[PDB]
Write a protein that binds this ligand. Structure first.
Ligand code: A1ILY
Length: 148
């Protein structure tokens, strides 16, 4: 799976990138596994996209949503879904939140909550069926990516 679960994953990942994990009992096992794998992918994508990223201006949540939709169209154009592509969604929201921290006009500290929202909406609406059919986060994602 439902929106709330995926929203919590997307928010936890933005708090990880922004170095502001929520004080308390901490993230779930699924969220901890995803943070590790998505960060590794994010570092590689930032290096590969360096020139592109140096000339982008993520000045608002609306612009971050437009850019996110454009990358997502190119990422899933062949219609296939797999777990690596789903990790790449999280890597792109991590890049967008870093850019918005630096370039947002009239910055708003709760902006990661709006970015998490549209990332969860995309994941639920476009990959939600595939995820449930492949075991969800607990019996699909975690089983594939948890430490050996
Ligand atoms: C610099 C180009 C650009 O502004 N954007 C962009 C287009 C396509 C990308 O595709 C990556 C590489 C191929 C796919 N596997 C994904 C990346 C970036 C826009 C649309 C954009 C810039 C920055 C961010 Cl973080 C998101 C989108």
């Amino acid at each position: 799976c439902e929106f709330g679960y995926i929203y919590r994953l997307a928010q936890d990942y933005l708090q990880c990138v922004l170095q502001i994990p929520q004080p308390g009992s901490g993230p779930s096992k699924t969220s901890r596994v995803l943070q590790n794998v998505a960060f590794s992918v994010q570092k590689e994508v930032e290096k590969n996209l360096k020139s592109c990223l140096d000339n982008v201006n993520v000045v608002s949540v609306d612009t971050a949503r437009t850019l996110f939709n454009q990358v997502m169209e190119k990422e899933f154009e062949d219609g296939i879904i797999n777990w690596g592509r789903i990790v790449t969604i999280f890597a792109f929201e991590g890049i967008l939140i870093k850019k918005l921290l630096r370039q947002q006009i009239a910055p708003d500290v709760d902006t990661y909550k709006e970015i998490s929202y549209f990332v969860a909406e995309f994941i639920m609406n476009n990959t939600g069926e595939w995820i449930r059919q492949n075991g969800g986060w607990e019996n699909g994602f975690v089983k594939k990516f948890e430490p050996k």
